[PDB]
Design a protein around this ligand. Structure first.
Ligand SMILES: [Ca+2]
Length: 579
DNA sequence: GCGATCAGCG
DNA sequence: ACGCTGATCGCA
């Protein structure tokens, strides 16, 4: 029902200088995954190519790698990485339909061509799930069915580029696509393919020692419980704590007694068992997620883990990281932080280099709200987290611990993003009217922040969406809901998204500027990870001194705000030491 | 498959 | 009853 040439060899008219291109990778994790089929749509026709022929053809490979042959695609990072695993370079992607749909509306959840095309009333293409099936029934269909699907996807991309670019232009997002998200996609592809080297012997040893410390705490729990039970079982655990031991019930879930860490912490004055449960969970979390889970996904021949950075998932413009998630490696407890000792440079005599924006969302908020006092604070390079800790815990600057600062950090963001007196009182374990009076004091010092919070809720109601500094957008239909709770969640999104999303915009621009700078200085240094406001690199030890001046400067100059941006940085032999 | 939970970023 | 996430595990 759509005409195309099921081609046996590559021809010249397949190599025009503008095309829609589909390089189909069906496995969700595309690292080292099969390419099951190729389709090209251009001015000369529609073509399906078997990958064993196309990717072994030197003219087609050269076309793939020629940046002057422009390709329109959907999820070009997926294709670029799968091709890197075949030793083939993809260049010249000038339009990525996934990223275009994401910028137009992140709430659509667009995960295939059909979903993007639906946004423009184009429906002559099937959802990937209808073609490949679900779960245990998932399969590549027979070649004629496969070929028509890939061709229909390519034809959709060919037809949809212009209407998507027109709407992007109307939203002031066309440079956001072409100068930020698409260049970033190529940089993320390099990062994912490079991977991060893991010291598996250290992990395996830590996992042996965890298993021993687990039994010891486990027996102490059975002994303090007076009996043995499944410590992971909410039935039995709730029964043990709140029926057998008769501890107070401070919170329930839709299914029963809550045993969350905040609850257990408040029960520490009542029974010694609750802090053993905490210790037990923390150890088991390290064991299951960060020892076992990490070893599962190491490629044994190279000792590398290859994350996937999802660039078109979060509602604020952040990245997320999957399989493994390398944006939530432990750091705050000394036991967990030692896992970072297993993250090592991928070459001898290289080192890990880590750089992070200081107080990033507060600096962004100061600029956007134009609060006189907050802008003055950052012009003085004050540490607002430490200052807030001093005031909360009634200590001097010298007395503030890393844990106290961590806590004041949640107070600072809690207040500006709409925490209530109740929530603040429950977090600080203080009176509720003391919490309310601390909140009113906070907005007395920062009245511009309060005005901003009020104004942005009104702008979201009037326009139906909010935006970031580089024109990323989030629609907030619930902001006019008549249901108080639904409306309230939407108001807090109006408060938070422009700030968190602008911080995402800034680090993304920083990454593009950094890669351009590293190429210009001809350095071997390269990015490995982004962790929201942090960039992790590795480089020969002979490049470190140059990087100590280069990376902070690139990050600090990525944008020019009404306050300075400030970067902290460290380097060392492992990720652990790069702090 | 989902909800509670907890690891991270602010 | 601050916001944005992903992985694991038990299932009242
Ligand atoms: Ca930071």
């Amino acid at each position: 029902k759509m005409a195309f040439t099921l081609a046996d060899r590559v021809t010249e008219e397949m190599l025009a200088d503008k095309a829609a291109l589909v390089v189909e990778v069906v496995e969700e994790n595309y690292h080292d995954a099969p390419i099951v089929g190729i389709a090209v749509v251009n001015e000369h026709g529609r073509f399906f190519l078997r990958p064993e022929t196309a990717l072994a053809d030197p003219q087609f490979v050269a076309w793939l790698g020629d940046e002057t042959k422009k390709k329109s695609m959907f999820d070009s990072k997926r294709a670029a990485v799968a091709l890197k695993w075949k030793g083939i370079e993809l260049c010249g992607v000038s339009f990525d339909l996934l990223l275009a749909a994401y910028l137009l509306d992140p709430a659509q959840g667009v995960d295939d061509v059909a979903a993007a095309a639906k946004m423009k009333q184009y429906e002559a293409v099937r959802p990937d799930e209808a073609v490949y099936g679900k779960g245990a029934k998932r399969a590549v269909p027979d070649e004629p069915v496969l070929a028509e699907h890939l061709v229909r996807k390519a034809a959709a991309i060919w037809e949809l580029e212009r209407p998507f670019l027109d709407e992007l232009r109307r939203n002031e997002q066309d440079r956001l696509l072409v100068e930020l998200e698409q260049p970033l996609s190529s940089i993320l592809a390099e990062m994912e393919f490079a991977g991060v080297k893991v010291d598996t012997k250290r992990l395996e040893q830590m996992g042996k020692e965890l298993a021993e410390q687990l039994g010891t705490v486990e027996q102490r729990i059975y002994e303090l419980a007076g009996q043995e039970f499944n410590i992971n079982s909410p039935k039995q655990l709730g029964v043990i704590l709140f029926e057998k031991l008769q501890l107070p019930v401070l919170k329930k879930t839709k299914t029963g007694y809550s045993t969350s860490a905040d609850v257990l912490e408040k029960l520490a004055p009542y029974h010694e068992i609750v802090e053993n449960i905490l210790h037990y969970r923390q150890l088991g979390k390290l064991q299951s997620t960060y020892i076992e889970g990490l070893l599962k996904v190491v490629r044994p021949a190279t000792k590398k883990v290859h994350t996937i950075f999802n660039q078109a998932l979060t509602q604020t413009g952040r990245l997320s990281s999957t399989e493994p998630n390398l944006q939530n490696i432990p750091i705050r407890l000394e036991e967990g932080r030692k896992i970072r000792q297993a993250f090592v440079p991928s070459e001898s005599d290289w080192l890990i280099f880590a750089a992070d924006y200081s107080q990033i969302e507060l600096r962004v908020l100061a600029h956007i709200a134009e609060d006189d006092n907050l802008m003055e604070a950052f012009r003085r390079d004050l540490d607002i987290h430490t200052k807030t800790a001093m005031d909360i815990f009634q200590v001097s600057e010298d007395e503030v611990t890393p844990n106290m600062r961590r806590q004041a950090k949640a107070v600072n963001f809690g207040i500006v993003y709409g925490i209530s007196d109740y929530g603040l009182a429950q977090n600080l374990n203080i009176s509720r009217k003391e919490a309310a009076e601390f909140i009113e004091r906070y907005f007395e010092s920062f009245p511009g922040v309060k005005r901003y919070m009020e104004n942005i809720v009104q702008e979201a109601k009037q326009k139906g969406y909010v935006t970031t500094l580089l024109h990323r957008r989030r629609y907030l239909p619930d902001i006019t809901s008549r249901n108080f709770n639904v409306r309230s969640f939407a108001e807090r999104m109006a408060m938070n998204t422009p700030i968190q999303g602008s911080a995402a915009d800034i680090i993304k621009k920083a990454m593009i500027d950094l890669n351009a700078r590293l190429k210009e200085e001809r350095l071997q240094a390269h990015l490995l990870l982004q962790v929201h406001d942090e960039l992790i690199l590795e480089a020969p030890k002979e490049e470190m001194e140059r990087l100590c001046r280069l990376v902070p400067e690139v990050m600090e100059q990525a944008v020019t705000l009404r306050v300075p941006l400030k970067v902290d940085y460290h380097y060392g032999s492992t990720w652990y030491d790069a702090k």
